[PDB]
Write a protein that binds this ligand. Structure first.
Ligand SMILES: NC(=O)CC[C@H](N)C(=O)O
Ligand SMILES: [Mg+2]
Length: 460
C-alpha cells in the first residue's frame, strides 16, 4: 500500500561491504554486536536484506484521531511562546554558512542525485563564497520554490554500522536517504531560523534535548527532573514501522504554520518528506510516510513528533489527563516522562498501538515498570549519576565495549579519543579496564585524570 514499485532507472551504486574492522578489544569483550548485513549472500543470516530493509514501508498508518491535532497545537503554543515567531526563511548564503545554531553546511558530504552518478561533489555545484548555484541546480531550486518537488529523488542505500547480533541474523539493516543538495539547501532555508533557536535551548521546558552536550546538560536536565516523584523512559525505535503520513500534515498546519512565522513553502517541503521517491540500485520506489534520514531537520522533526505522540497516548489512555500532568524530554527515539503521578505505560502502549505507534521501555525489559525514578532511567544510552550538585552521563557498559570492539581504518585514534570522554563517567577502574586491551599492545590512551579534569572544569 505505502510502497509503490515505479519503473526501473539506471543502477545507482549501493555499497555492499562493510568498512568496519575489529580491534584487539573484540576478542576480550566479545560484544553481542557486529557489522550490519549489506549483502544478499551474507552467511550470518538466512534472510534477504533487500526485502527485509524495505518491509517497514509496505504499510503505513493512513489516519490519526483528533487528539493528535489537539496535542500538536498545544505543544506548538508552548514552544513558540518560548522561542518566538520570527521563523521566516533564510537566504542561500545563510543556509550554506549557517548561523549561531547549527554549524555551517557540510561541503564534503554526498550531493545526492543526479550529481553522484555524474561524479560531482557539493563544491562543484555551488561556490561557498557569494552562494551561486550552477544553472541546472538553480532551475531545480526555482522549480521547488514554485511548489513543484516532482523532480527530486532520494539516493537510498544500506547503513554500514554496528547492529545487535539478532538484527544482524535477521538481516534487519537500516537505510540511509541522501536528498539532492538543493533540496537540503531549501530545507535549511525554510527551517534553519527555527532550528537555530530550538537546538540551542534544550531542556524540560522546551520538551527537547536536541543540540545538547551531555557533559554539561546532564546536570541541568537532572536538576530539573530530580524534584518529580518519578521519571519514566520510553523508546520509540521500531524497525518494522515508520511515522504516519498524517503526522506530517499535522506538523505542517499546527506546528510549522504561517501563523507561527514560517514560510508558505514549508507545507510543500514537509510533503516532499512525507511522500518521496527513492532510488535503490535500478529499483525506484514511491514511499508513503516515514522520515528521510539524511535531511538536516530529521532528528528535530522526529523529536517533536515523538513529544506530541506520548501526550496523545496519555490523553487516549486517561480521560482525566491534562497537558501539564507530565513534563517531557525528547531526543529522536529516546524520551523521558517526568511526573508526580503514577502512570501505567503498558496501557499507554496499548493505546498508541491502535494508531500504529510502538513504544517500549528504554532498557532490555519487555514491559513498563509502574515505579521508576531519575536514577533508574536510561536516556541516549546514559544513566543519571549524582555527583554533588551535578549529574554525569554514565554510559551503558555494553555500548562502550561495542564501540571499542570495531573501528574504521584511518580514524582509530580520534574514535578512541571520543570514547575516553564517554568512558570517563564510569570511574577510573572501569575506564582503565575498557582501554586495557589497547594499552597492553602499546597504544597510548589519554589518562583518566586528564579527561576527568576536563569535565570537572566545565563547572568551576
Ligand atoms: N523513520 C521514521 O519516520 C520512523 C521512525 C519511528 N521512530 C519508528 O517507529 O520507526
Ligand atoms: Mg544498519
Amino acid at each position: 500500500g505505502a510502497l509503490e514499485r515505479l519503473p526501473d532507472g539506471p543502477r545507482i551504486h549501493v555499497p555492499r561491504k562493510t568498512a568496519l574492522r575489529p580491534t584487539v578489544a573484540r576478542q576480550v569483550f566479545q560484544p553481542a554486536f557486529a557489522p550490519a548485513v549489506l549483502s544478499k549472500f551474507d552467511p550470518r543470516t538466512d534472510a534477504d536484506v533487500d526485502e527485509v530493509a524495505f518491509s517497514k514501508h509496505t504499510s503505513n498508518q493512513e489516519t490519526l484521531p483528533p487528539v493528535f491535532r489537539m496535542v500538536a497545537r498545544e505543544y506548538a503554543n508552548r514552544v513558540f511562546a518560548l522561542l518566538g515567531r520570527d521563523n521566516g526563511r533564510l537566504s542561500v548564503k545563510q543556509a550554506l554558512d549557517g548561523l549561531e545554531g547549527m554549524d555551517p553546511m557540510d561541503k564534503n558530504t554526498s550531493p545526492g542525485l543526479p550529481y553522484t552518478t555524474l561524479g560531482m561533489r557539493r563544491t562543484d555545484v555551488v561556490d561557498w563564497e557569494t552562494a551561486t548555484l550552477i544553472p541546472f541546480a538553480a532551475e531545480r531550486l526555482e522549480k521547488m520554490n514554485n511548489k513543484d518537488f516532482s523532480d527530486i529523488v532520494y539516493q537510498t542505500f544500506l547503513k554500514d554500522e554496528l547492529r545487535p547480533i539478532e538484527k544482524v541474523q535477521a538481516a534487519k539493516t537500516r537505510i540511509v536517504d541522501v536528498p539532492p543538495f538543493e533540496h537540503c539547501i531549501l530545507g535549511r532555508q525554510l527551517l534553519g531560523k527555527f532550528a537555530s533557536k530550538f537546538q540551542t535551548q534544550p531542556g524540560l521546558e522546551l520538551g527537547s534535548a536536541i543540540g545538547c552536550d551531555p557533559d554539561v546538560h546532564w546536570t541541568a536536565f537532572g536538576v530539573a527532573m530530580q524534584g518529580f516523584e518519578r521519571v519514566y523512559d520510553v523508546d520509540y525505535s521500531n524497525f518494522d514501522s515508520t511515522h504516519s503520513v498524517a503526522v506530517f500534515r499535522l506538523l505542517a498546519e499546527e506546528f510549522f504554520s504561517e501563523e507561527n512565522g514560517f514560510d508558505p513553502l514549508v507545507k510543500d517541503y514537509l510533503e516532499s518528506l512525507a511522500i518521496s521517491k527513492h532510488a535503490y540500485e535500478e529499483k525506484r520506489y514511491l514511499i508513503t510516510g516515514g522520515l528521510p534520514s539524511g535531511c538536516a531537520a530529521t532528528s528535530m522533526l522526529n523529536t517533536i513528533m515523538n513529544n506530541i505522540i506520548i501526550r496523545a497516548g496519555l490523553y487516549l489512555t486517561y480521560k482525566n489527563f491534562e497537558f501539564d500532568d507530565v513534563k517531557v524530554l525528547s531526543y529522536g527515539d529516546d524520551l523521558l516522562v517526568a511526573t508526580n503521578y503514577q502512570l501505567n505505560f503498558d496501557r499507554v502502549r496499548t493505546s498508541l498501538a491502535k494508531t500504529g505507534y510502538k513504544i517500549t521501555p528504554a532498557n532490555k525489559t519487555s514491559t513498563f515498570p509502574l515505579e521508576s525514578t531519575l536514577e533508574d532511567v536510561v536516556f541516549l544510552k546514559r544513566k543519571f549519576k549524582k555527583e554533588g550538585p551535578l549529574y554525569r552521563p554514565v554510559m551503558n557498559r555494553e555500548a562502550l565495549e561495542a564501540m571499542l570492539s570495531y573501528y574504521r581504518p584511518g580514524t582509530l585514534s580520534e574514535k578512541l579519543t571520543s570514547i575516553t570522554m564517554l568512558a570517563v563517567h564510569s570511574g577510573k577502574q572501569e575506564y582503565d579496564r575498557l582501554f586495557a586491551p589497547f594499552r597492553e599492545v602499546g597504544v597510548i590512551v589519554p589518562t583518566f585524570e586528564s579527561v576527568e579534569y576536563r569535565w570537572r572544569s566545565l563547572f568551576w
